[PDB]
Each structure stands twice: as structure tokens, then as C-alpha cells.
Amino acid sequence: SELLVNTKSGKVMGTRVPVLSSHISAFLGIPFAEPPVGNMRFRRPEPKKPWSGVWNASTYPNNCQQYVDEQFPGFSGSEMWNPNREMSEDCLYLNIWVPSPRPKSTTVMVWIYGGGFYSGSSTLDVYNGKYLAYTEEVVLVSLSYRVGAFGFLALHGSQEAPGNVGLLDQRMALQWVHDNIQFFGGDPKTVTIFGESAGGASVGMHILSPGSRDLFRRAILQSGSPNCPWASVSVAEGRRRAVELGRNLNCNLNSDEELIHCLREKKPQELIDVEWNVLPFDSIFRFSFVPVIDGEFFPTSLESMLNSGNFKKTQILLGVNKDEGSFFLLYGAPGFSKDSESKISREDFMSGVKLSVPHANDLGLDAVTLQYTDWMDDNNGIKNRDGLDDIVGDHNVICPLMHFVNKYTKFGNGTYLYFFNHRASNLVWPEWMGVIHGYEIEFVFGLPLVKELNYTAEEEALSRRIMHYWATFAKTGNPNEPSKWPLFTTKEQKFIDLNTEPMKVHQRLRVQMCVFWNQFLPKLLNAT
Amino acid sequence: SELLVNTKSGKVMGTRVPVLSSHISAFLGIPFAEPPVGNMRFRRPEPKKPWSGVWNASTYPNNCQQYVDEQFPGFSGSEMWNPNREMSEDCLYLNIWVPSPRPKSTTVMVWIYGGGFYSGSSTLDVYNGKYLAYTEEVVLVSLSYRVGAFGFLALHGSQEAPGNVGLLDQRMALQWVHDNIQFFGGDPKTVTIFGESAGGASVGMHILSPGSRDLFRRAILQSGSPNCPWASVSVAEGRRRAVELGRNLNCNLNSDEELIHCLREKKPQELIDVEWNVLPFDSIFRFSFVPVIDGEFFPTSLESMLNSGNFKKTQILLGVNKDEGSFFLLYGAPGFSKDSESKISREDFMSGVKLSVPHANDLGLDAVTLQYTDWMDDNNGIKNRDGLDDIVGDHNVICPLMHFVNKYTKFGNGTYLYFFNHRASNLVWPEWMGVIHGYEIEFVFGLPLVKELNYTAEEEALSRRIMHYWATFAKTGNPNEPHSQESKWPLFTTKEQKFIDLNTEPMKVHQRLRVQMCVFWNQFLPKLLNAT
Ligand SMILES: *[C@@H]1O[C@H](CO)[C@@H](O)[C@H](O)[C@H]1NC(C)=O
Ligand SMILES: *[C@@H]1O[C@H](CO)[C@@H](O)[C@H](O)[C@H]1NC(C)=O
Ligand SMILES: *[C@@H]1O[C@H](CO)[C@@H](O)[C@H](O)[C@H]1NC(C)=O
Ligand SMILES: *[C@@H]1O[C@H](CO)[C@@H](O)[C@H](O)[C@H]1NC(C)=O
Ligand SMILES: *[C@](C)(O)CCC[N+](C)(C)C
Ligand SMILES: *[C@](C)(O)CCC[N+](C)(C)C
Ligand SMILES: C[C@H](O)CCC[N+](C)(C)C
Ligand SMILES: C[C@H](O)CCC[N+](C)(C)C
Ligand SMILES: [Cl-]
Ligand SMILES: [Cl-]
Ligand SMILES: [Cl-]
Ligand SMILES: [Cl-]
């Protein structure tokens, strides 16, 4: 049967699904690991044990336990990212979309959701893989991984909570694809991993990790890179936060085993309730439990690995959105509101930069402020808003990614860079937020291809060329089929805009601000 | 007899000089102090003692001993600033231009030449006061003062070389005008002191010094202010340089008496020959012997005096030129040339910044570089050249002056700020240098009024309105003639911070002169260099 497939762990029964007046096969919720519950919490994933009989893969799996955004109840703009199904610690499953009829040894694309390592689900609507698999004729796989304390509580030294188990879950899903994709028509030697935000940083982290390199061919990073200021913490900071989580819940802190046994007896929601209380400062775009530089998953510091060229060398395609910071200002900075232009006073601006760069001293803050303030008109609320918007975006996403792109390109086998700056016509967020973090995703997954969603014809065309750039890249290492997307080189550093207008080539994406964030500020904070 | 005037020191005989189809009286080379020669060198000035007979004041006096620029032999562009008379230590004289017939009690303007405190003369052609005195009917005075080591060697503690004696030479000349100017038809209760560059810093220094305050009514500062990074040094830095000068001449450095005795035995040109060897680092827009914060002429730090309003409270009129730094880049920065477009490579740009901000640590250097570099086009020779020009002008003149103007205005009784940006049609310097440091002076002294100088008709009108702004200000404290038709030069206020461009085009009112860069130079950089 086209829907009955024998994997190395047992049989799975898919389900024929409708897609743009046609159909394709869908295998939903296939377990790739043993449920990390009970004494397996915080522990590395163990491969799923073979099962007898046919596994029902007709419906979506549970979503991992996570913090749920209740800021705007009923508002689709924020809820579209919340878990759309029951949450459970038994959430290590993956989904596959195969074109019908089943192709032979075709290109595979593995999706890794973002969510700051504290949230995310593979079941979200904007992650529906049928459109992209059908349109570009590829086998699309979406995996899942533990988030929050469940996936990143780090107590280096211990083996019950070693940290980075979330990344290890992703690795096990990729390993599962390496061993079973061929049974669905996928070509295991031609696998492209791609993810947004934390999912982009994960992709970058697998590119760096030795144990992940042989599990994929090429990579796509969207609005995220391994070196982002929020994507990782030292073993020391990981332990401090881990112990503070214990303290917040009145745990025995005499030793790691005692601390862990205590944390394993608490209910999921009890941990999640105090998760944010472990951050060291009041801030925005900062998350509690993220990956740790342990010397194992990550041999040495991310920077040294990048300079020595110690990482997978292949073709990468990465980019960013025009306004990466608005989403986080809205949730944690004063003066911002969902129902107004959000003109920021001068005082709120000050408060904002302090929140954006929580680790910087006063001189550093003065530096950031001077760098983003037009002194011929400092009391302009619109300019203060946009300045804060750029600060959050340049420092947390754009510049860290540019540092990654320049470093990678020295050893890579081909880089393609993009700047996504299109404002969806049906966006439900206010206009001041601009091209929001994560909203290029709907275009990558072909959502504009469905009439009922009311997009414009120009946006449908945009989505079709983006999906084709992604797919063509995944199968050849070049988004161009034999206007051409120029290759990003160390010398010319070219990149293209990604919108409804004809292609345009630019050079040195936000080089001025990034020289400030990648060279000057770091140097200033080290010296003072 | 208009030309025969008896002063408190003795009689003086002036001369009738022609001026624009008319005539005016001129008293040139009148002594106001005793020759600071021999055992007087480095010492505070002493009042000129009464003389017998009539002093012949029909010719210019000698110029003080100073470094002479010979970079471009024969070039009018540079030589117009060199001594045009024999140099001598006996140089403490002043010049006076009086309208004819002699006014009864008119406005007086005293000119203090600039030249980095290491050069300058009251006798240059560009300082010919007959045009200004005649056109605005004011009594114009040209004073002089010891420059270089002769006027600023400072060994705090000693009374033989106390420092700031050049500033005291100026004070004594003002005291002379205060006591004798009435004899020339001018009102000592209405004297305006004005100067350019080091002259402008000087004027600002008299405004701050309790000992100069009662010697003048108002003040005009052109491209220079007291707080400029080059206008002064600490007593410690002054001593190091003083001692260093001795070491450069094999002097007994065992005590101030011996050192000073050794230096008084040397010939003028001998001191001058090693003057530049005492500077801390390789640099541009830095001079060896300048005023010192001695706690005497200057009660406390210049900054604390401005924050507390410890200074004369009157009306001031000040400003700067568009390209203050090009002149100093041509003389000491790699890549610059008089006979070229001077496109600066990235390599020379780096060197230039190091040279422009000699007191900066590596971090401070990166900060400056980043602040004036367009990273989307870093190898652009022209942007690199103009960047450097801006750096040197902002750090050394413009921003220090904006700091001054904003502090003074909080206590002053009237402030007018200008931005001179007109390139003379007959400039001899290369186009890249733009509106050069010091070239607004010719417009101030009416040079554009003499036909053979070939200025355009619009430059003559510009000169006339500038001289009128200056004089009217001197007379009333407001450069604008009440209820007149012409566009009004607005007051600079702490709130709106208005200023006007000064050129051949109609008047334009602007706000916050170079605030962006000046916030960098006045607020950010200092905090950065402080930390460690
Ligand atoms: C698989 O589960 C779905 C939903 O629970 C159900 O509709 C379907 O019948 C199941 N598969 C079969 C036929 O066993
Ligand atoms: C990728 O590697 C191949 C083979 O080593 C080489 O020919 C090609 O130039 C490389 N591509 C780029 C753009 O680095
Ligand atoms: C003053 O000096 C000038 C120039 O040397 C001369 O013409 C004039 O006669 C002198 N006056 C007297 C009477 O000495
Ligand atoms: C200057 O002082 C006078 C006298 O008190 C005062 O009336 C006037 O308002 C002041 N002018 C300015 C510009 O401060
Ligand atoms: C990234 C920080 O992983 C944040 C992604 C946020 N959503 C809302 C797009 C999931
Ligand atoms: C000022 C630093 O005192 C410079 C004066 C130089 N000239 C060329 C205008 C005389
Ligand atoms: C963007 C976002 O939902 C941040 C989470 C909000 N707090 C820190 C209040 C829990
Ligand atoms: C500004 C100026 O002409 C400097 C004179 C040149 N040095 C320092 C070399 C003697
Ligand atoms: Cl559909
Ligand atoms: Cl639900
Ligand atoms: Cl290359
Ligand atoms: Cl300022």
C-alpha cells in the first residue's frame, strides 16, 4: 500500500490528504524516540523500541510541555504559535508528507520549529507540510524536541541532566530519517535541514556539532544563527539557572542527584510556572533554558570553532526579516501596544535599550544610545520606536547572523543570503511592527497558495518562487535553476531582497550597524 | 592737531593714512609695556614707563620672535601669516586707527591675533584696520603678545617664568586702552575684544579670568574658544615641556633658577629651533607652549568655571568656518598635498585619526574611526579625505566651541552664533581645502572693499554686512539694527539653539550646529577615555 510503510522500528499507516485540488500521503505522529517521562526527564533521548502491529499515523501528536502565550486571548496573531493540541512530556514524534505517487530517492527537507527554545510545536498550521511537498515534489519532514527545562536544564557533570537534550532529540529525529526516509521515497544522502529563529540556530548548531554533521546534506537558516546572544549559555550560567529553578520550587540543593530527583517529582506546569524567574536580568529576547557550551555536543566555544573552520562544509542559504525586533518589544518594553502606533517617549527609549542589552554597563548603553539616536530630533516618538526596533533586531538576529555568514563563507562551499522585507496584506498585527519575526514562514510553506486565506496574487507568486528557491537549493545547493540569486562571497558580499518586486542585488547588509555590534561594542565591554 | 595725542605715558605722533578715497588717522607701534628682554624674558610684563618728547607712531613695530613657516617659499597663501617686519623680543606694542575727524566717545574694538600661541603678528596686511575703522566709524586697536616659549614657558611655583605671561601681555594692553583710549576719541566703557583661533581662545580666557573682566564690555570669538583641546595644558604638562626644552639645549636641570637662567642666556632662534621637540606625541593641531591652568589667572578648571557661571556675564558673538581642519592636515598628515586632490587611502586615514586624536587609547581610536567611516564605501578616497577634515575640525574647533556656547548661554546676557561657509572666489589654496581656518578674517577687516584685490561684488557686500554685524554688535550687544528691514540674526537660546550661515546667499536660520558629532566629542568620547 502507498499508505502502509515498514520502517526499521515497525509498520506505520498514513492517510491520504487533500491539497490544492489533489492529494498526497501524510504520516503524522511517528515516534522516533522513547517517551522521556518519569525518570527519563532531563535525560538524553533513547531510540524508540520496535513495535508490533500497525502504528496509527493518521493524526497529529501531542505537543511538548511549554509556556503558553495568553497575552491576547482569541487573537490569531499570537495564538497561531500556541500548541494546537494536548501537551505532554511524551511528545517526541515527527511528521512526513510524501507526494503521491511515491517518488523514488527524492530530495528531503527537515523542518525544525523555533520558539526561543522555550516553546514551539511541529503541529502548527503555518507548518502544514502538504503544500510545499506537493508543489515542489519533495518529502517534507517536521520533527519535534523538548523545550524549556525539559529539554535544556543543564547540570554539566551529571548524566541525568547533562543539558542539550533538546538538540539531541533533533539529532535522533535526523538519525531516524537517515535510516527510514528511503522507505517513504526519500533520498537519505540528500537531506536539507531548515528552521526559523531557534530552529535556525539549531540548524546552525548541527552544522557545528561533529555528531550531527553526517546526518544531513545542506542547511537553511531563517532569522537565527548558533551565535545569537540568546541561543546559548556557559556551563556555569546553566548550572546557576538550574539551581535557581530548584530554589524557586523549594528543592533540596545539596547535590545534583538530590536536586534532580526533586525536580522530577514536580508536575510539568509547576516548572513552567517559575521558568522565567531564573533569568539574571530584566530583559527582552532572553530565555531561561537554552543550549549549553559543554565541550561535548560543542567541542569548543562557538567562535573558536568558526575561526578554525571546525564545522560541516557545504552549501547554506540564510536570511532575515526587516523588523526582527517589534514582536519582543511589544511583549516586554514600555510604551508599546498592539492597538496604537506606539510612539516611544525619550524615557521609555532609555528603559528600552537597558532591556535590550541587559549585560552592558553604562558606557555600553551610552554607546548603543548614541548609535541609534538622531540628535537633531531626539524627542520624535516614531524615530525612537524604530530605533528600538532596529536595536533589538540588529543585536539579537541580523548582526549575529551576518557574523556567522562571513565566518562560514571562508570555508563553506557556497552561501546565499536574503533580506525578507514584504508586509503581508492580511497581517493582523499593527503596522508599526512592520515585517515581523517569523512571518516569512507562511511564505516558505506555501500558505499564500490557498484561496480561503485571502492573500494577493503577487504574494502567491512570491511564495511560489520562495518555495522553489528553497526546494531547488535543497536538491542541488543552488536556489537558481539552470534573475539569478548571486552567491555571497567574502569580497563582494552580495544578497538579494525577497519581496513582490523584481529581484534586486545589494551588498554588505547593515554593515554599518553590524560593525558596531560585532566589533566595537564587544571590544568596549571587554575593555570596560 | 589730530595726529598729536598725549597719553598717560607721554606724547605720541600718528600719521594720516589714505583709505578708500578718504583718510583716517593711524597710530602705529605705540609701546604699552617694557621690552621683555634679557632678565625680563619669561617674566610678567611691566608697564611702559613715561617717555619724553613725541613718540613717532607712523610705522609698524617689530613682530615677536616666532617660528616662521617655510613649507611653501613664495606662496602667498602661507606667507601672508608670517612676520612682515623684523622679529625682536622687544615687540610689546599696539596699533590704533581713529576716524577723521576724531570721534568724541565712540565704540572701541581691540584685535587679538591668533596663530596657535606660537606665532602671529599685529602687522599683517589682513589685519590692516583702516578699512573697518573707517567704514563703521569705530576706534580699532591692534595689540600684540609674546608667543611660544617667550610668552608661555610655565614652571608653576617660580615667579621668573610663572606662565601665561602672554595672556598678561594682552591684559596690560587692554589696561592701556582702558586708561588712554579716551584720548583718541573712544569710550573705554564700550570696548569689544575680538580674535580668531588662539585669539578667540584668548578672548574666551579673558571672559573667564577675574583679572580681565573689568577691562572690556563685550566679546567676539572666531574659530576658537578657551576650552579647545590645544588652547591649554596643566601645570604638570607645562613643567614637563619646560624641562624638556632645557634638556634639548643641554641646560642645567637641577632647579628652576638654573634652568631659567640657562634659557635666558640662549638666543631667541635657539629656543625656537627645538620648540616642537617638547610635544608629547606625533600630532596635528597641537602646540608646545600655551596657557596653563595655574589657579591664578585661571581660578579653577575651565569646565568647573563654566558650570558655575564663574565668568563675565555679557553679550558674545561667536562662530566657526566650514572646514576648520584642512589647513592642519595639509601640514602634518600623510596623503595630503597642496598640488593634488588629496584622495586619502584607508591606510592614511587610519594614520590620520591616530595623529588627530593623539591622546586617545586604542578603544577611543576605534570609536572615532567608526564614527566617521561609511562602511558601505570605506576605500572612497574623497569620503576619507573629508572625514579627516571633519574629524580635525570637530575635535579641535567646532565642538569645543559648541560646548562653550551652550554653557555660557545659561548665564550670559545674549548669544549670537554663526557658521561661516563661503569659499572666496580668489583663494590661492586648493579646492579640497574648502572654507579654510582663518579665511573669514579678510571679510571681517574689509579686504573685499579694495578693488585691486579682485573680490566679487557679492563678496564686497558680504564683507560690508559682516563688518556691520560686528560693529553694531560692538556698539549695542546686538548685531541687528533695531526696526531695520534686513533679515534678523536670531539670538541663540539654550532651547532652540539657533544660528545663521554667513555667505553671499540670503540669510538662513539653522538649529543645533553639528549636534550629532558634538554629542560624540563632548559627551561620549570623554566618558570612554576615562574608563579603564
Ligand atoms: C487512527 O486514528 C484515527 C483517529 O483516532 C481514526 O479515525 C482511525 O480510524 C484510526 N485508524 C484505524 C482505521 O485504525
Ligand atoms: C565547492 O567545492 C568544489 C569542489 O571542491 C569546488 O569546485 C567549488 O568551487 C566549490 N564551490 C564554492 C563556491 O566554494
Ligand atoms: C616718523 O617716521 C616717519 C617714517 O620714518 C617719517 O616719515 C617722519 O618724518 C618721522 N617723524 C619725525 C618728525 O621724526
Ligand atoms: C540682559 O539683562 C537685562 C537686564 O536685566 C535683561 O532685562 C535682559 O532680558 C537680558 N537679556 C538677555 C538676552 O538675557
Ligand atoms: C525564535 C526566538 O526561536 C523566536 C521565534 C518566535 N515565534 C513566534 C515565531 C515562534
Ligand atoms: C589658531 C590655532 O590660533 C590658528 C591660527 C592660524 N592662522 C593661519 C589663521 C593664522
Ligand atoms: C514574547 C513572549 O510571550 C515573552 C514571554 C512573557 N513573559 C516574560 C512575561 C512570561
Ligand atoms: C601647524 C604647523 O605649521 C606645524 C609646524 C611643523 N613642525 C611641527 C614639523 C615643525
Ligand atoms: Cl486546502
Ligand atoms: Cl487544544
Ligand atoms: Cl569566497
Ligand atoms: Cl554639544
Side-chain angles (χ1 to χ4, degrees):
Chain A
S1 181
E2 193 180 10
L3 298 179
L4 203 187
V5 180
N6 290 64
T7 71
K8 298 189 179 300
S9 302
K11 301 169 181 175
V12 299
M13 178 68 89
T15 171
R16 196 153 198 279
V17 297
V19 53
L20 307 175
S21 64
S22 186
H23 309 71
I24 62 174
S25 304
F27 303 80
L28 314 177
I30 295 171
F32 70 76
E34 282 292 293
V37 291
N39 273 55
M40 293 190 82
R41 179 183 291 176
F42 306 128
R43 200 178 293 169
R44 293 191 178 70
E46 222 61 60
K48 175 65 175 181
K49 290 191 294 300
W51 62 83
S52 56
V54 184
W55 185 291
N56 186 328
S58 77
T59 59
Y60 276 133
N62 290 300
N63 295 131
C64 294
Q65 292 283 185
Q66 56 190 283
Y67 168 88
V68 184
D69 168 40
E70 297 168 57
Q71 248 283 157
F72 306 120
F75 179 53
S76 66
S78 57
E79 253 148 45
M80 68 180 262
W81 306 105
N82 287 328
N84 57 338
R85 354 198 81 282
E86 220 80 298
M87 291 189 283
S88 163
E89 271 181 283
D90 173 23
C91 60
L92 300 189
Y93 298 80
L94 53 71
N95 310 291
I96 305 174
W97 278 275
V98 191
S100 181
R102 180 183 305 171
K104 303 174 63 174
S105 186
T106 187
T107 306
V108 178
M109 289 173 82
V110 177
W111 177 250
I112 307 185
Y113 60 65
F117 291 118
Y118 74 82
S119 57
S121 305
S122 68
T123 62
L124 302 183
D125 282 333
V126 287
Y127 299 162
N128 196 319
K130 60 180 180 172
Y131 307 110
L132 177 63
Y134 169 81
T135 301
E136 293 303 301
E137 305 190 76
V138 302
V139 170
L140 189 64
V141 178
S142 57
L143 50 74
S144 67
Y145 59 99
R146 285 172 285 177
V147 295
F150 308 112
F152 298 97
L153 181 89
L155 280 173
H156 192 51
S158 172
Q159 292 302 313
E160 289 294 294
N164 297 330
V165 294
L167 288 176
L168 291 178
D169 290 338
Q170 308 182 335
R171 179 180 291 174
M172 191 153 294
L174 296 175
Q175 177 66 56
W176 188 91
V177 179
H178 180 284
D179 305 332
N180 304 278
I181 196 61
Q182 68 195 65
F183 301 128
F184 300 80
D187 173 7
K189 302 174 90 305
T190 307
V191 169
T192 289
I193 53 177
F194 68 133
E196 187 269 337
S197 201
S202 290
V203 164
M205 296 177 170
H206 286 299
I207 281 181
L208 291 177
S209 188
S212 297
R213 298 177 197 166
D214 303 307
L215 299 178
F216 62 105
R217 185 63 174 298
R218 315 167 209 295
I220 293 178
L221 300 74
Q222 304 173 198
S223 298
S225 57
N227 54 301
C228 287
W230 49 268
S232 72
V233 302
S234 67
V235 297
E237 176 67 39
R239 173 173 292 286
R240 208 229 75 218
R241 299 183 181 186
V243 170
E244 190 62 22
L245 183 65
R247 176 175 298 94
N248 271 281
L249 301 168
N250 295 298
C251 271
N252 186 307
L253 312 176
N254 288 316
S255 73
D256 296 333
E257 274 292 306
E258 301 195 68
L259 172 53
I260 297 178
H261 293 323
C262 178
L263 291 176
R264 285 180 176 162
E265 312 305 338
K266 327 302 298 190
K267 293 175 177 180
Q269 202 57 57
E270 290 184 66
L271 274 53
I272 300 172
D273 282 323
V274 298
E275 188 179 314
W276 305 93
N277 304 355
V278 307
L279 285 177
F281 315 115
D282 285 308
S283 70
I284 60 175
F285 221 129
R286 287 296 180 279
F287 322 112
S288 294
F289 303 98
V290 296
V292 286
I293 304 309
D294 62 350
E296 179 173 47
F297 183 101
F298 294 110
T300 59
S301 78
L302 302 183
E303 186 70 320
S304 64
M305 290 186 84
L306 285 175
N307 287 323
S308 63
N310 180 23
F311 55 75
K312 183 180 181 64
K313 296 177 187 56
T314 178
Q315 303 78 45
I316 57 174
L317 180 154
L318 62 185
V320 302
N321 291 11
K322 178 188 181 181
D323 306 290
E324 305 282 11
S326 54
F327 191 94
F328 302 83
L329 287 168
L330 173 53
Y331 281 75
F336 293 97
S337 167
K338 190 182 74 60
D339 310 304
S340 70
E341 298 176 70
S342 294
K343 291 166 182 292
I344 306 304
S345 74
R346 193 65 203 166
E347 172 173 293
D348 286 343
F349 181 78
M350 245 52 260
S351 285
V353 325
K354 174 63 168 176
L355 263 21
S356 302
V357 189
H359 46 299
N361 47 43
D362 295 298
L363 186 67
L365 291 173
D366 295 323
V368 170
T369 306
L370 182 52
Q371 187 75 183
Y372 289 91
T373 294
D374 158 31
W375 283 110
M376 293 175 73
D377 185 25
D378 59 295
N379 286 301
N380 178 159
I382 283 183
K383 281 174 175 171
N384 284 329
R385 180 195 65 194
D386 296 359
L388 225 49
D389 188 74
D390 291 312
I391 289 172
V392 181
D394 293 335
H395 171 61
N396 293 294
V397 183
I398 300 184
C399 294
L401 174 141
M402 293 306 304
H403 181 71
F404 178 80
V405 79
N406 281 297
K407 290 293 178 184
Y408 190 82
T409 303
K410 293 183 185 304
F411 300 94
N413 195 222
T415 306
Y416 296 92
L417 174 56
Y418 76 77
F419 187 70
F420 188 88
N421 59 6
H422 172 62
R423 167 83 181 190
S425 61
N426 52 28
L427 220 289
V428 299
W429 293 98
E431 290 185 59
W432 74 261
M433 289 181 74
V435 186
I436 310 179
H437 177 72
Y439 284 69
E440 84 294 353
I441 294 177
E442 50 197 64
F443 282 81
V444 167
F445 280 78
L447 274 298
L449 295 237
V450 26
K451 318 302 89 171
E452 312 88 69
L453 301 186
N454 301 297
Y455 284 77
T456 72
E458 294 69 32
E459 295 175 312
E460 184 184 310
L462 170 59
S463 178
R464 285 177 179 288
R465 51 184 290 256
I466 285 177
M467 293 196 275
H468 197 71
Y469 284 145
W470 266 231
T472 300
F473 169 81
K475 52 191 68 169
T476 73
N478 187 318
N480 299 297
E481 278 197 304
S483 297
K484 292 191 183 307
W485 187 330
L487 193 63
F488 175 99
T489 68
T490 300
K491 175 72 89 68
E492 287 148 289
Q493 304 166 55
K494 296 178 179 182
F495 78 85
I496 71 176
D497 286 325
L498 222 47
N499 50 55
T500 58
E501 295 192 303
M503 173 176 281
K504 289 293 298 180
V505 176
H506 302 303
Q507 304 186 190
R508 309 191 173 194
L509 171 48
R510 293 187 74 64
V511 63
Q512 196 69 50
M513 296 300 96
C514 290
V515 170
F516 170 83
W517 293 106
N518 297 328
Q519 291 182 292
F520 187 71
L521 188 61
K523 198 161 181 292
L524 176 148
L525 292 173
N526 184 65
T528 72
Chain B
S1 182
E2 277 184 301
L3 308 177
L4 182 54
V5 179
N6 43 69
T7 77
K8 262 68 149 53
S9 300
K11 299 190 191 70
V12 161
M13 180 66 110
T15 179
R16 180 124 55 268
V17 301
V19 55
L20 301 175
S21 301
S22 187
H23 304 80
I24 55 167
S25 308
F27 301 72
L28 310 169
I30 295 174
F32 68 76
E34 290 292 296
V37 301
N39 52 90
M40 305 273 272
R41 177 190 294 170
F42 304 133
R43 202 171 300 180
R44 294 195 180 76
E46 211 69 31
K48 172 64 174 184
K49 40 192 56 177
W51 63 82
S52 301
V54 184
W55 186 288
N56 190 336
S58 62
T59 63
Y60 277 142
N62 298 313
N63 294 146
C64 296
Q65 295 288 172
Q66 52 190 285
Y67 169 79
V68 180
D69 168 44
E70 289 166 353
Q71 253 297 167
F72 307 115
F75 187 57
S76 62
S78 57
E79 310 198 307
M80 65 176 276
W81 305 108
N82 290 331
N84 58 334
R85 285 289 182 295
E86 174 180 65
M87 297 180 283
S88 164
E89 266 178 288
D90 174 34
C91 59
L92 298 185
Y93 304 74
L94 51 79
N95 312 296
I96 312 180
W97 284 273
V98 174
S100 178
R102 181 189 305 175
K104 261 181 181 297
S105 184
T106 195
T107 313
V108 179
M109 289 169 85
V110 178
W111 177 250
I112 306 178
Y113 61 65
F117 289 117
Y118 75 89
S119 59
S121 303
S122 65
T123 61
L124 304 178
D125 299 317
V126 72
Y127 301 158
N128 197 323
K130 69 178 180 185
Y131 305 105
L132 180 53
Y134 169 95
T135 303
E136 297 302 314
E137 299 186 55
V138 305
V139 167
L140 187 55
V141 173
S142 191
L143 62 73
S144 61
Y145 60 101
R146 291 174 284 170
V147 298
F150 305 100
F152 298 98
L153 180 80
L155 290 169
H156 197 55
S158 169
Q159 297 294 306
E160 296 298 349
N164 295 324
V165 293
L167 283 168
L168 290 173
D169 289 337
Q170 295 179 6
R171 178 178 290 172
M172 192 129 92
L174 295 182
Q175 179 67 61
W176 187 94
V177 175
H178 177 276
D179 303 339
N180 300 284
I181 210 57
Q182 64 196 64
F183 304 126
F184 296 82
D187 170 27
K189 299 172 78 296
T190 312
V191 48
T192 292
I193 59 174
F194 68 134
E196 186 270 337
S197 207
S202 296
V203 174
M205 292 175 164
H206 287 298
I207 289 185
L208 295 176
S209 182
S212 301
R213 298 182 188 173
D214 303 311
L215 298 184
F216 62 101
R217 181 60 172 295
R218 294 183 259 282
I220 298 180
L221 306 81
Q222 310 173 199
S223 297
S225 62
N227 60 306
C228 286
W230 49 264
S232 74
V233 301
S234 62
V235 289
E237 178 55 19
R239 171 171 293 288
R240 205 200 82 278
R241 296 185 188 182
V243 169
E244 192 60 14
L245 178 65
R247 192 185 68 68
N248 267 279
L249 307 159
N250 300 311
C251 274
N252 183 303
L253 311 177
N254 301 314
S255 70
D256 301 332
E257 302 78 355
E258 307 179 65
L259 168 55
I260 296 172
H261 175 283
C262 183
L263 293 175
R264 294 190 178 175
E265 297 293 4
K266 302 297 174 178
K267 281 192 167 185
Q269 198 52 45
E270 293 195 68
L271 288 70
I272 306 174
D273 279 324
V274 296
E275 184 180 303
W276 310 86
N277 296 343
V278 308
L279 287 181
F281 338 90
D282 291 343
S283 57
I284 55 178
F285 222 131
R286 285 295 174 287
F287 317 118
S288 294
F289 301 102
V290 304
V292 290
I293 305 306
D294 63 354
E296 177 173 49
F297 186 102
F298 292 108
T300 69
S301 67
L302 307 185
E303 186 63 21
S304 72
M305 287 181 79
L306 295 174
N307 292 332
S308 66
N310 188 2
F311 54 78
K312 191 181 171 59
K313 278 98 171 180
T314 191
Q315 307 84 57
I316 60 166
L317 184 154
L318 70 179
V320 302
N321 291 358
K322 173 167 149 288
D323 303 287
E324 297 292 350
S326 64
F327 180 91
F328 305 83
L329 285 170
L330 165 66
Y331 283 74
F336 294 91
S337 169
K338 185 171 78 74
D339 315 298
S340 164
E341 199 173 6
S342 279
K343 299 189 176 185
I344 306 302
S345 70
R346 199 61 199 162
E347 194 185 301
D348 291 333
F349 178 79
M350 302 281 90
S351 296
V353 306
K354 169 73 171 173
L355 255 49
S356 301
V357 196
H359 52 296
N361 53 28
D362 204 63
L363 188 68
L365 288 181
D366 297 339
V368 174
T369 296
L370 179 57
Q371 191 79 179
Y372 289 87
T373 296
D374 176 353
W375 283 115
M376 292 181 273
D377 194 33
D378 57 300
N379 283 301
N380 192 311
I382 293 178
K383 291 180 181 175
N384 291 319
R385 179 196 64 203
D386 298 340
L388 235 48
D389 176 54
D390 280 320
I391 292 189
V392 178
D394 291 341
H395 175 57
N396 295 289
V397 179
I398 302 178
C399 292
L401 188 147
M402 290 315 295
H403 186 69
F404 181 76
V405 63
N406 279 297
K407 289 291 183 175
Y408 187 85
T409 298
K410 300 291 292 181
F411 296 98
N413 186 236
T415 302
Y416 298 83
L417 174 60
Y418 76 75
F419 184 67
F420 187 81
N421 62 347
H422 175 69
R423 164 91 178 183
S425 59
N426 59 14
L427 211 69
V428 293
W429 294 97
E431 190 80 45
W432 71 266
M433 294 178 87
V435 191
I436 307 174
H437 180 74
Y439 283 71
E440 81 287 347
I441 298 178
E442 47 197 58
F443 285 76
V444 162
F445 286 73
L447 281 291
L449 272 56
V450 22
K451 277 291 181 177
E452 43 274 11
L453 293 191
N454 288 169
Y455 286 85
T456 64
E458 17 286 299
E459 290 172 316
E460 188 190 316
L462 173 58
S463 183
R464 289 178 172 290
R465 55 186 292 257
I466 283 176
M467 282 188 288
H468 197 59
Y469 283 147
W470 264 231
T472 304
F473 168 76
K475 303 196 182 72
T476 70
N478 185 328
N480 303 299
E481 290 192 300
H483 60 67
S484 71
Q485 280 63 60
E486 288 83 298
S487 49
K488 301 294 184 299
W489 182 337
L491 270 165
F492 172 91
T493 58
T494 166
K495 182 179 181 56
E496 290 141 66
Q497 302 166 52
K498 299 179 178 179
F499 76 86
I500 67 168
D501 289 326
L502 226 35
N503 51 50
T504 43
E505 303 182 311
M507 187 179 300
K508 291 193 183 72
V509 176
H510 298 299
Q511 297 188 197
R512 309 204 182 196
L513 171 45
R514 298 187 69 70
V515 268
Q516 201 64 45
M517 295 302 90
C518 291
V519 171
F520 172 81
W521 296 102
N522 299 321
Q523 293 180 54
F524 187 62
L525 193 55
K527 289 193 61 180
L528 182 161
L529 299 180
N530 190 77
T532 187

